[PDB]
Amino acid sequence: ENVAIENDGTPPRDKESLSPLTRFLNNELYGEKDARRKIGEITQTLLDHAVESQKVTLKGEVGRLTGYYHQGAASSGKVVLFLHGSGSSAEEQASEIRNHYQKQGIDMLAVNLRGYGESDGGPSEKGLYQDARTMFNYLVNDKGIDPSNIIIHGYSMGGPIAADLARYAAQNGQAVSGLLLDRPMPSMTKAITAHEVANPAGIVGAIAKAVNGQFSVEKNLKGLPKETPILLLTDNEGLGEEGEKLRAKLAIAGYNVTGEQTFYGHEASNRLMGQYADQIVSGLFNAEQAAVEAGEVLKGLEKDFKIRTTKDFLNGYKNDHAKEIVDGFRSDMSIKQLVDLFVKGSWSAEQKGALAWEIESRALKVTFQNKSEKYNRLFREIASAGVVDAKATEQLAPQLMLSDPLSKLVLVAKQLENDGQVGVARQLLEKMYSAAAVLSNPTLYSDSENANASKLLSSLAAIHAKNPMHDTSMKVWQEKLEGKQALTVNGVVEKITDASANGKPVLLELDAPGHAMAAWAKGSGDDRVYGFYDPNAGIVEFSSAEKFGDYLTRFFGKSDLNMAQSYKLGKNDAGEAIFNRVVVMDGNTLASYKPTFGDKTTMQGILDLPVFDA
């Protein structure tokens, strides 16, 4: 089924083309026929120095797939499959990037897809994925690269394609080493309307509506093992803006997504590869992860290094206020250098608040990784056994190396989600991740976006200081099951699972003496799902009430994980665990609460705060 593929041949090159609409759609999608094939003479002159492997032609599914293979350098034996984007030839797109791998001693396979360069055929989505695999099958069979220490690379469109290939390789047991989404197209539809302006309704939107669900990175990645390292590097233009939106979706879903947003334009290959080549080639193996774990626990030491109510501190807790009145501090410094700026000359009540925001805003991004594998293992064990669950989700929700606030909110969301709205729990997390990236690199993103993130950050802080349970103006709870009316572990499963209500939400808050957790039920009939948020173990939902019981008991009890003992909560009369307190909460009351006196944004308004303006 997967034999050798090399084949030389020397005719001129074939084509497709159809009905005059679909022609000047295909032109819009993939580039004009001539533009696809033009190789510029300066490149050809350089490539005509295949005088020191260097030229390639493979048997594609609809014809020949021409291109070039590029050797390593003067001196640890690995290759970059390069999948090119639309608009130009593979030789032109690669010419800029082809050198930065070369000099490190990395090979690269730059092969054209159907309809590009000198390759036979006409561009087609199902076909372009097929041609990508041909290039892959040239690397392992024809040139026998070791199982897989190869990276995909990964481009505008090359991205969606790269994603698809990476899934096929894994599914077929030839699992590739790394994926690189280099300034990628999130989806064809969104790639069109981004480079064009806003959201027109004429032809540009008719094309977009036509090409819906084509070249979708998230859609092509579903199937890929989540451990597979993905490096996602975005441009500074509107395709990055949609790329960073994607990044968050991919992070929360749980893919191994690294990288940042660049400040380079979508066509600026040489400048981007100029900076990121090191980070890219250090991005395909696993220590690596040890080397950033070390620098990770670094800032964990510096958090242990580390008034909240007093009016002076709150006057200084905001963006760009430290840069005026606190000397010694630059805006480009690390947390290591900012926390050291705290302990040099130690400051007034207002100046301490100014550094607090500046430190805790950088800190937000560091809350999301890591997560201990046991919690992922336990989630996978529950989905595996029995009738596998359709809506079994898992979200990397921020773990606040610092809950108190999130746990209040996750419940607000599920009320809203029960009332017909949907995804807002998931969206909150993404927006928190997005806001982190914005605050943790302030220069890149706009004045407005820096401002919006510091409002979501502010709202989280305001819930931290002023709790709804510690409040008298309204009552956000229905009842408090504590004392000898306190619920057992299975007692929480019963209130959540009991279907004597089948159209209403069950919004619990599970209070251990250290950490404060939550759990819920929403939905109608088939859609009815039961869920649980732990601060330092992410979120899980299941639509099978039995699978919820399996997880939740294995989470706390001795059967598997035994996280009850470790979460330091006392035993009941028979000798089992019972939470300190268990709040059955009112969603509508809680959703109307405002954390700041003077500000009119409610808990539901906090959920719907923007981060990226649009």
Coordinates of C-alpha atoms in Angstrom, one line a residue:
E1 CA 0.0 0.0 0.0
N2 CA 2.9 2.4 0.7
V3 CA 5.7 1.6 -1.9
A4 CA 8.6 3.7 -3.3
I5 CA 7.5 6.8 -5.3
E6 CA 10.4 8.5 -7.1
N7 CA 10.0 8.7 -10.9
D8 CA 11.8 10.9 -13.3
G9 CA 10.2 12.2 -16.5
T10 CA 10.5 15.2 -18.9
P11 CA 7.4 16.4 -20.8
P12 CA 5.8 19.9 -20.3
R13 CA 3.2 20.3 -17.6
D14 CA -0.6 19.6 -17.7
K15 CA -3.7 21.4 -16.3
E16 CA -7.4 21.6 -15.3
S17 CA -9.8 24.5 -15.7
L18 CA -13.7 24.4 -15.7
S19 CA -16.6 26.9 -16.1
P20 CA -15.7 30.6 -16.1
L21 CA -17.1 31.2 -12.5
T22 CA -15.3 28.3 -10.9
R23 CA -12.2 29.4 -12.9
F24 CA -12.1 32.9 -11.4
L25 CA -13.0 31.4 -8.0
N26 CA -10.1 28.9 -8.2
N27 CA -8.0 31.8 -9.3
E28 CA -9.1 33.7 -6.2
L29 CA -8.5 30.7 -3.9
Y30 CA -5.2 29.3 -5.2
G31 CA -3.7 32.1 -7.3
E32 CA -3.8 32.7 -11.1
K33 CA -2.5 29.8 -13.3
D34 CA 0.6 31.7 -14.4
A35 CA 1.4 33.0 -10.9
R36 CA 1.3 29.5 -9.6
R37 CA 3.9 28.3 -12.1
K38 CA 6.3 31.2 -12.5
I39 CA 9.7 30.5 -10.9
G40 CA 11.8 33.7 -11.0
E41 CA 15.1 33.6 -12.9
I42 CA 17.2 34.6 -9.8
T43 CA 15.9 31.6 -7.9
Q44 CA 16.4 29.3 -10.9
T45 CA 20.0 30.6 -11.3
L46 CA 20.6 29.8 -7.6
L47 CA 18.8 26.4 -7.9
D48 CA 20.8 25.6 -11.0
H49 CA 23.6 25.1 -8.5
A50 CA 22.4 21.6 -7.8
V51 CA 26.1 20.8 -8.3
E52 CA 26.7 19.8 -4.6
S53 CA 19.7 14.7 -4.1
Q54 CA 19.0 18.3 -5.4
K55 CA 16.1 17.9 -7.9
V56 CA 13.0 15.9 -7.5
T57 CA 9.9 14.5 -9.2
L58 CA 7.4 12.2 -7.6
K59 CA 4.4 10.2 -8.9
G60 CA 1.3 12.2 -7.7
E61 CA -2.3 11.0 -7.7
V62 CA -3.3 13.2 -10.7
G63 CA 0.2 13.6 -12.3
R64 CA 3.8 14.6 -11.7
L65 CA 4.8 16.6 -8.7
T66 CA 8.1 18.4 -9.4
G67 CA 10.3 20.2 -7.0
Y68 CA 13.7 20.2 -5.2
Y69 CA 15.3 18.6 -2.2
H70 CA 18.0 20.6 -0.3
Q71 CA 21.0 19.1 1.5
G72 CA 22.5 19.9 4.9
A73 CA 25.7 21.8 5.6
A74 CA 29.4 21.7 6.5
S75 CA 30.3 20.1 9.9
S76 CA 22.0 16.1 13.4
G77 CA 20.5 14.2 10.4
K78 CA 16.8 15.4 10.2
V79 CA 14.5 16.8 7.5
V80 CA 11.8 19.5 7.0
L81 CA 8.9 18.5 4.8
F82 CA 7.9 21.9 3.4
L83 CA 4.3 22.4 2.4
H84 CA 3.9 25.7 0.5
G85 CA 1.0 28.2 0.4
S86 CA -1.1 29.5 -2.4
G87 CA -0.3 32.3 -4.9
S88 CA 3.3 31.5 -5.9
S89 CA 5.4 28.4 -6.7
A90 CA 7.1 26.2 -4.1
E91 CA 10.5 27.3 -5.4
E92 CA 9.7 31.0 -4.8
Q93 CA 8.1 30.5 -1.4
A94 CA 10.9 28.3 -0.2
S95 CA 13.8 30.4 -1.6
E96 CA 13.8 32.7 1.5
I97 CA 13.3 29.9 4.1
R98 CA 15.4 27.2 2.4
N99 CA 18.6 28.8 3.7
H100 CA 17.9 29.1 7.5
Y101 CA 17.4 25.3 7.8
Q102 CA 20.4 24.6 5.5
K103 CA 22.9 26.5 7.6
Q104 CA 22.0 24.5 10.7
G105 CA 22.5 21.3 8.9
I106 CA 18.9 20.5 8.2
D107 CA 17.6 19.1 4.9
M108 CA 14.3 20.3 3.3
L109 CA 11.9 18.8 0.8
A110 CA 10.4 21.7 -1.2
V111 CA 7.9 20.1 -3.5
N112 CA 5.1 21.7 -5.5
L113 CA 1.5 20.7 -5.1
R114 CA -0.8 20.0 -8.1
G115 CA -1.1 23.1 -10.3
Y116 CA 2.0 24.8 -8.9
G117 CA 5.5 25.3 -10.3
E118 CA 6.1 22.4 -12.8
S119 CA 3.7 19.9 -11.2
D120 CA 0.9 18.4 -13.2
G121 CA -2.7 19.0 -12.2
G122 CA -5.2 21.6 -11.0
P123 CA -5.6 22.6 -7.3
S124 CA -8.2 20.7 -5.3
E125 CA -8.7 20.4 -1.5
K126 CA -9.0 16.5 -1.3
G127 CA -6.2 16.4 -3.9
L128 CA -3.8 18.8 -2.2
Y129 CA -3.9 16.7 1.0
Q130 CA -3.1 13.6 -1.2
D131 CA -0.1 15.3 -2.8
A132 CA 1.2 16.3 0.6
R133 CA 1.3 12.6 1.6
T134 CA 3.1 11.7 -1.6
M135 CA 5.9 14.1 -0.5
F136 CA 5.8 12.3 2.9
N137 CA 5.9 8.9 1.3
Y138 CA 9.0 10.1 -0.7
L139 CA 10.7 10.9 2.7
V140 CA 10.2 7.6 4.5
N141 CA 10.1 5.0 1.8
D142 CA 12.1 6.4 -1.1
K143 CA 14.7 8.0 1.1
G144 CA 14.2 6.0 4.3
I145 CA 14.4 8.7 6.9
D146 CA 14.3 7.2 10.4
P147 CA 10.8 6.5 11.7
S148 CA 10.0 10.1 12.3
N149 CA 12.3 12.8 13.1
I150 CA 10.9 15.0 10.4
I151 CA 8.9 18.2 10.7
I152 CA 6.1 19.4 8.5
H153 CA 6.3 23.2 7.9
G154 CA 3.4 24.3 7.5
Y155 CA 2.4 27.5 5.8
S156 CA -0.4 29.8 4.7
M157 CA -2.6 26.9 3.5
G158 CA 0.5 24.8 4.0
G159 CA -0.9 25.0 7.6
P160 CA -4.3 23.3 7.1
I161 CA -2.5 20.8 4.8
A162 CA 0.3 20.3 7.2
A163 CA -2.3 19.7 9.9
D164 CA -4.1 17.1 7.8
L165 CA -0.8 15.3 6.9
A166 CA 0.3 15.2 10.6
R167 CA -3.0 13.5 11.5
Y168 CA -2.7 10.9 8.6
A169 CA 0.9 10.1 9.7
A170 CA -0.2 9.5 13.3
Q171 CA -3.3 7.5 12.3
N172 CA -1.0 5.4 10.0
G173 CA 1.7 4.8 12.6
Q174 CA 4.4 6.9 11.0
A175 CA 3.8 9.7 13.6
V176 CA 5.8 12.8 12.6
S177 CA 8.1 14.6 15.1
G178 CA 6.7 18.1 15.0
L179 CA 4.1 20.4 13.3
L180 CA 4.9 24.0 12.4
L181 CA 2.0 26.3 11.6
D182 CA 3.9 29.2 10.0
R183 CA 1.6 32.2 9.6
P184 CA -1.2 29.9 8.8
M185 CA -4.6 30.1 7.2
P186 CA -7.1 29.2 10.0
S187 CA -9.8 28.5 7.5
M188 CA -10.3 29.3 3.8
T189 CA -13.4 31.3 4.6
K190 CA -11.6 33.3 7.3
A191 CA -8.5 33.7 5.1
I192 CA -10.5 35.4 2.4
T193 CA -12.5 37.8 4.6
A194 CA -9.4 38.7 6.7
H195 CA -7.2 39.9 3.8
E196 CA -10.3 41.5 2.3
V197 CA -12.0 44.0 4.5
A198 CA -14.4 43.3 7.4
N199 CA -17.4 41.3 6.1
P200 CA -18.8 42.4 2.7
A201 CA -21.9 40.7 1.2
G202 CA -21.1 40.8 -2.5
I203 CA -18.7 38.4 -4.2
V204 CA -16.0 38.3 -1.6
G205 CA -18.6 36.9 0.9
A206 CA -20.3 34.7 -1.6
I207 CA -16.9 33.0 -2.2
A208 CA -16.4 32.7 1.5
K209 CA -19.8 31.1 2.0
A210 CA -19.1 28.7 -0.9
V211 CA -15.8 27.5 0.6
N212 CA -17.1 26.9 4.1
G213 CA -15.3 24.1 6.0
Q214 CA -12.4 23.9 3.6
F215 CA -8.8 24.2 4.8
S216 CA -9.7 24.4 8.5
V217 CA -6.7 23.8 10.8
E218 CA -8.8 22.9 13.9
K219 CA -10.9 20.6 11.8
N220 CA -7.9 18.9 10.2
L221 CA -6.2 18.5 13.6
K222 CA -9.1 16.7 15.2
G223 CA -7.7 13.1 15.3
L224 CA -4.1 14.1 16.0
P225 CA -2.7 13.0 19.3
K226 CA -2.7 16.0 21.7
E227 CA 0.9 15.3 22.8
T228 CA 2.2 16.0 19.2
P229 CA 4.1 19.3 19.5
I230 CA 2.5 22.1 17.5
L231 CA 4.4 25.3 17.0
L232 CA 2.1 28.2 16.0
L233 CA 3.7 31.4 14.7
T234 CA 1.4 34.2 13.6
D235 CA 1.8 37.3 11.4
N236 CA 1.2 40.8 12.7
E237 CA -1.7 41.3 10.3
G238 CA -5.4 40.2 10.2
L239 CA -4.6 36.5 9.5
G240 CA -2.6 36.4 12.7
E241 CA -5.5 38.2 14.6
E242 CA -7.6 35.1 13.4
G243 CA -4.6 32.9 14.1
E244 CA -4.3 33.9 17.7
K245 CA -8.1 33.4 18.1
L246 CA -7.3 29.9 16.8
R247 CA -4.3 29.4 19.1
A248 CA -6.6 29.9 22.2
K249 CA -9.1 27.4 20.9
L250 CA -6.3 24.9 20.3
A251 CA -4.7 25.5 23.8
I252 CA -8.0 25.1 25.7
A253 CA -8.8 22.0 23.7
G254 CA -5.5 20.6 24.9
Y255 CA -3.1 20.4 22.0
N256 CA 0.6 20.9 22.7
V257 CA 0.6 24.4 21.3
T258 CA 3.8 26.5 21.7
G259 CA 5.1 29.7 20.1
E260 CA 3.9 33.3 20.1
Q261 CA 2.7 36.0 17.8
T262 CA 5.5 37.6 15.7
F263 CA 5.7 41.2 14.6
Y264 CA 6.5 40.3 11.0
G265 CA 4.2 40.6 7.9
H266 CA 2.6 37.5 6.4
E267 CA 5.0 37.4 3.4
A268 CA 8.2 38.2 5.5
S269 CA 9.7 34.8 5.5
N270 CA 13.4 35.7 5.8
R271 CA 12.8 38.1 8.7
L272 CA 10.6 35.5 10.6
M273 CA 12.9 32.5 10.0
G274 CA 15.7 34.9 10.8
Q275 CA 14.4 35.1 14.3
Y276 CA 12.6 31.8 14.9
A277 CA 14.8 29.2 13.2
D278 CA 16.5 28.2 16.5
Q279 CA 13.1 28.0 18.4
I280 CA 11.7 26.0 15.4
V281 CA 14.5 23.4 15.3
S282 CA 14.5 23.2 19.1
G283 CA 10.7 22.6 18.8
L284 CA 10.5 19.0 17.6
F285 CA 11.9 17.0 20.6
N286 CA 11.3 16.6 24.3
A287 CA 14.2 18.2 26.3
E288 CA 13.3 20.9 25.1
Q289 CA 10.4 20.5 27.6
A290 CA 12.8 19.7 30.4
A291 CA 14.8 22.9 29.5
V292 CA 11.6 25.1 29.7
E293 CA 10.4 23.2 32.7
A294 CA 13.5 24.3 34.6
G295 CA 12.9 28.0 33.6
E296 CA 9.2 27.2 34.4
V297 CA 9.8 26.2 38.0
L298 CA 12.1 29.3 37.9
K299 CA 9.1 31.6 38.1
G300 CA 7.5 29.2 40.5
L301 CA 10.3 29.9 42.9
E302 CA 9.8 33.7 42.2
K303 CA 6.0 33.3 43.0
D304 CA 7.0 31.8 46.3
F305 CA 9.3 35.0 46.5
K306 CA 6.3 37.3 46.4
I307 CA -3.5 45.5 51.5
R308 CA -5.6 44.0 48.8
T309 CA -8.6 45.9 50.1
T310 CA -6.9 49.3 51.0
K311 CA -7.8 52.2 48.7
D312 CA -4.2 53.2 48.0
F313 CA -3.3 49.8 46.5
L314 CA -6.3 49.8 44.2
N315 CA -5.4 53.3 42.9
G316 CA -2.1 51.8 41.6
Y317 CA -3.4 48.4 40.3
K318 CA -3.6 49.3 36.6
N319 CA -1.8 49.4 33.2
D320 CA 0.9 51.9 32.4
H321 CA 0.7 53.5 35.9
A322 CA 4.0 52.0 37.2
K323 CA 5.8 53.4 34.2
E324 CA 5.1 57.0 35.4
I325 CA 5.7 57.0 39.2
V326 CA 7.9 53.9 39.9
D327 CA 11.6 54.3 38.9
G328 CA 14.1 51.5 38.1
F329 CA 11.5 49.5 36.1
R330 CA 11.5 49.0 32.4
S331 CA 8.5 47.6 30.5
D332 CA 10.6 44.9 28.7
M333 CA 11.9 43.3 32.0
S334 CA 11.1 39.7 33.0
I335 CA 9.2 38.6 36.1
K336 CA 12.6 37.7 37.6
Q337 CA 13.8 41.4 37.1
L338 CA 10.3 42.9 38.1
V339 CA 10.1 41.0 41.4
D340 CA 13.7 41.9 42.1
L341 CA 12.7 45.6 41.4
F342 CA 10.1 45.1 44.2
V343 CA 12.8 44.0 46.7
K344 CA 15.5 46.8 46.0
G345 CA 13.8 50.0 47.2
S346 CA 10.5 48.9 49.0
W347 CA 7.6 51.2 48.2
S348 CA 4.5 53.2 49.3
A349 CA 1.0 51.8 49.3
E350 CA 0.1 53.1 45.8
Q351 CA 3.5 52.3 44.2
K352 CA 3.3 48.7 45.5
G353 CA -0.1 48.4 43.7
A354 CA 1.5 49.7 40.4
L355 CA 4.1 47.0 40.4
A356 CA 1.5 44.4 41.5
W357 CA -0.5 44.8 38.3
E358 CA 2.8 44.8 36.3
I359 CA 3.9 41.6 37.9
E360 CA 0.6 39.7 38.1
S361 CA -0.2 40.6 34.4
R362 CA 3.0 38.9 33.2
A363 CA 2.1 36.1 35.6
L364 CA -1.2 35.3 34.0
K365 CA 0.3 33.4 31.1
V366 CA 2.3 31.2 33.4
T367 CA -0.9 29.9 35.1
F368 CA -2.0 27.7 32.1
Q369 CA 0.7 25.0 31.8
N370 CA 1.8 22.7 33.3
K371 CA -0.8 20.0 34.1
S372 CA 0.0 16.7 35.8
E373 CA -0.6 13.8 33.5
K374 CA -2.6 11.8 36.1
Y375 CA -5.6 14.1 35.5
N376 CA -5.4 13.6 31.8
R377 CA -4.9 9.9 32.4
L378 CA -8.0 9.6 34.6
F379 CA -10.1 11.5 32.0
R380 CA -8.9 9.1 29.2
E381 CA -9.6 6.0 31.4
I382 CA -13.2 7.1 31.8
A383 CA -13.8 7.8 28.1
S384 CA -12.1 4.4 27.2
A385 CA -14.1 1.9 29.3
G386 CA -17.8 1.3 28.5
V387 CA -19.9 3.0 25.8
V388 CA -17.5 5.7 24.8
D389 CA -18.9 9.2 25.6
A390 CA -19.8 11.5 22.7
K391 CA -19.5 14.8 24.5
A392 CA -16.6 13.9 26.9
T393 CA -14.6 17.2 26.9
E394 CA -11.5 18.4 28.8
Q395 CA -10.4 22.0 28.9
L396 CA -7.0 23.4 30.1
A397 CA -8.6 26.1 32.2
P398 CA -6.1 28.4 34.0
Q399 CA -4.6 26.8 37.1
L400 CA -3.7 30.0 38.9
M401 CA -0.3 29.3 40.3
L402 CA -1.3 32.1 42.8
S403 CA -10.3 29.1 41.2
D404 CA -11.8 31.5 43.8
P405 CA -13.0 33.6 41.0
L406 CA -13.3 31.2 38.1
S407 CA -15.2 28.7 40.2
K408 CA -17.8 31.4 40.9
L409 CA -18.0 32.0 37.1
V410 CA -18.0 28.6 35.5
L411 CA -21.4 28.2 37.3
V412 CA -22.7 31.6 36.0
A413 CA -22.0 30.4 32.5
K414 CA -23.8 27.1 32.9
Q415 CA -27.0 28.9 33.9
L416 CA -26.6 31.0 30.7
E417 CA -25.8 27.8 28.7
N418 CA -28.9 26.2 30.1
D419 CA -31.0 29.2 29.0
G420 CA -30.2 28.5 25.3
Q421 CA -26.8 30.3 24.9
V422 CA -23.8 27.9 24.3
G423 CA -20.0 27.7 24.5
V424 CA -19.6 30.6 27.0
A425 CA -17.7 28.6 29.5
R426 CA -15.3 27.4 26.8
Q427 CA -15.2 31.1 25.5
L428 CA -14.3 32.5 28.9
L429 CA -11.2 30.3 29.1
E430 CA -10.1 31.2 25.6
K431 CA -10.5 34.9 26.3
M432 CA -8.6 34.5 29.5
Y433 CA -5.8 32.8 27.5
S434 CA -6.0 35.5 24.8
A435 CA -6.0 38.3 27.5
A436 CA -2.9 36.7 29.0
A437 CA -1.0 36.7 25.8
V438 CA -2.0 40.4 25.3
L439 CA -0.9 41.5 28.8
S440 CA 2.3 39.3 28.7
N441 CA 3.4 41.1 25.6
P442 CA 1.8 44.5 25.6
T443 CA 3.6 46.3 22.6
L444 CA 2.3 43.8 19.9
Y445 CA -1.4 44.4 20.4
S446 CA -3.4 47.6 20.2
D447 CA -4.1 50.4 22.8
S448 CA -7.7 49.1 22.8
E449 CA -6.8 45.5 23.2
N450 CA -4.3 46.2 26.0
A451 CA -7.1 48.1 27.7
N452 CA -9.7 45.4 27.3
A453 CA -7.4 42.6 28.8
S454 CA -6.7 44.7 31.9
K455 CA -10.5 44.9 32.4
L456 CA -10.9 41.1 32.3
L457 CA -7.9 40.9 34.6
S458 CA -9.4 43.6 36.9
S459 CA -12.7 41.8 37.1
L460 CA -11.0 38.6 38.1
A461 CA -9.0 40.5 40.8
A462 CA -12.2 42.2 42.0
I463 CA -13.9 38.8 42.5
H464 CA -10.7 37.7 44.4
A465 CA -10.9 40.5 47.0
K466 CA -14.7 40.8 47.3
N467 CA -16.4 37.3 47.5
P468 CA -20.2 36.9 46.8
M469 CA -20.5 34.6 49.9
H470 CA -18.9 37.4 51.9
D471 CA -21.7 39.8 50.8
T472 CA -25.0 41.1 52.5
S473 CA -26.7 43.3 49.8
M474 CA -28.0 40.2 48.0
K475 CA -28.0 36.4 48.5
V476 CA -26.4 34.5 45.7
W477 CA -27.1 31.0 47.2
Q478 CA -30.2 28.8 47.8
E479 CA -28.9 26.6 50.6
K480 CA -25.6 25.7 52.2
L481 CA -25.2 21.9 52.9
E482 CA -22.7 21.8 55.8
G483 CA -22.2 20.4 59.3
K484 CA -24.0 17.1 59.7
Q485 CA -26.2 18.1 56.7
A486 CA -23.0 18.0 54.6
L487 CA -22.8 15.9 51.4
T488 CA -20.6 12.9 50.8
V489 CA -18.7 12.3 47.5
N490 CA -21.6 10.2 46.1
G491 CA -23.9 12.7 47.7
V492 CA -22.6 15.3 45.2
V493 CA -23.0 12.8 42.4
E494 CA -26.7 12.3 43.4
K495 CA -27.7 16.0 43.4
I496 CA -25.9 16.5 40.1
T497 CA -27.2 13.3 38.4
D498 CA -30.8 13.2 39.8
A499 CA -33.2 13.7 36.9
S500 CA -36.3 14.6 39.0
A501 CA -35.5 17.9 37.4
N502 CA -34.6 17.5 33.8
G503 CA -34.8 21.0 32.5
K504 CA -33.1 23.0 35.1
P505 CA -29.5 23.6 36.0
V506 CA -27.8 22.2 39.0
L507 CA -25.0 24.6 40.1
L508 CA -22.9 23.4 43.0
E509 CA -19.8 24.7 44.6
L510 CA -17.6 22.2 46.4
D511 CA -15.5 23.8 49.2
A512 CA -12.5 22.0 50.5
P513 CA -10.5 23.9 53.2
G514 CA -7.6 24.8 50.9
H515 CA -9.0 24.8 47.4
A516 CA -12.5 25.7 46.3
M517 CA -14.0 23.6 43.4
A518 CA -17.2 23.4 41.5
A519 CA -19.5 21.0 39.6
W520 CA -22.7 21.3 37.5
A521 CA -25.5 19.9 35.4
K522 CA -27.2 21.6 32.4
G523 CA -29.1 20.7 29.3
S524 CA -32.2 18.9 28.1
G525 CA -32.6 15.1 27.7
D526 CA -29.8 13.9 25.4
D527 CA -27.9 17.2 25.6
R528 CA -27.9 17.0 29.4
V529 CA -24.3 17.0 30.6
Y530 CA -22.7 16.8 34.0
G531 CA -19.4 18.6 34.8
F532 CA -16.7 19.5 37.3
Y533 CA -14.0 22.2 37.7
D534 CA -10.9 21.7 39.7
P535 CA -8.5 24.6 39.8
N536 CA -5.2 22.6 39.4
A537 CA -6.7 19.8 37.2
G538 CA -8.7 21.6 34.5
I539 CA -12.4 21.0 33.7
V540 CA -14.3 17.9 32.6
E541 CA -17.8 17.3 31.3
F542 CA -19.6 14.1 30.5
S543 CA -23.1 13.3 29.1
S544 CA -23.0 9.9 30.8
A545 CA -23.9 10.3 34.5
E546 CA -22.2 7.0 35.3
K547 CA -18.9 8.1 33.7
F548 CA -19.2 11.3 35.8
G549 CA -19.5 9.2 39.0
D550 CA -16.5 7.0 37.8
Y551 CA -14.3 10.1 37.4
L552 CA -15.4 12.1 40.4
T553 CA -15.0 9.2 42.9
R554 CA -11.7 8.1 41.4
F555 CA -10.6 11.7 41.6
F556 CA -11.3 12.0 45.3
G557 CA -11.3 8.4 46.7
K558 CA -8.6 5.8 47.3
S559 CA -9.7 3.6 44.3
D560 CA -7.4 5.5 41.9
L561 CA -6.0 9.0 42.5
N562 CA -7.0 9.6 46.2
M563 CA -7.0 13.5 45.8
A564 CA -9.3 13.8 48.8
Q565 CA -6.6 13.0 51.4
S566 CA -4.2 15.4 49.6
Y567 CA -6.9 18.2 49.4
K568 CA -6.9 17.9 53.2
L569 CA -10.6 17.4 54.0
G570 CA -12.1 15.6 57.0
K571 CA -13.9 12.3 57.3
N572 CA -17.5 11.7 58.3
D573 CA -19.0 9.3 60.8
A574 CA -18.7 6.1 58.6
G575 CA -15.1 7.1 57.6
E576 CA -15.6 8.6 54.1
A577 CA -14.9 12.2 52.7
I578 CA -17.4 15.0 52.9
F579 CA -16.7 18.5 51.7
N580 CA -16.5 21.3 54.3
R581 CA -19.4 23.0 52.6
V582 CA -21.4 22.4 49.5
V583 CA -23.3 25.5 48.0
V584 CA -26.4 24.9 45.8
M585 CA -26.3 28.3 44.1
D586 CA -28.8 30.5 42.3
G587 CA -27.5 31.3 38.8
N588 CA -29.6 34.3 38.0
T589 CA -28.8 36.0 41.4
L590 CA -25.1 35.2 41.0
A591 CA -25.1 36.3 37.4
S592 CA -26.4 39.8 38.5
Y593 CA -23.7 40.3 41.2
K594 CA -21.1 43.0 40.6
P595 CA -17.7 42.8 42.2
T596 CA -16.8 46.5 42.1
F597 CA -19.0 49.1 43.8
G598 CA -19.4 51.9 41.2
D599 CA -19.0 49.6 38.2
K600 CA -22.2 48.2 36.6
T601 CA -20.6 45.1 34.8
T602 CA -22.3 42.1 36.3
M603 CA -20.8 38.5 36.6
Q604 CA -22.6 37.8 33.2
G605 CA -21.0 41.0 31.9
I606 CA -17.6 39.8 33.0
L607 CA -18.2 36.6 30.9
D608 CA -19.0 38.8 27.9
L609 CA -16.0 41.2 28.1
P610 CA -14.1 41.5 24.8
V611 CA -10.3 40.9 24.4
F612 CA -9.7 41.1 20.6
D613 CA -11.7 44.0 19.1
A614 CA -13.3 43.3 15.8

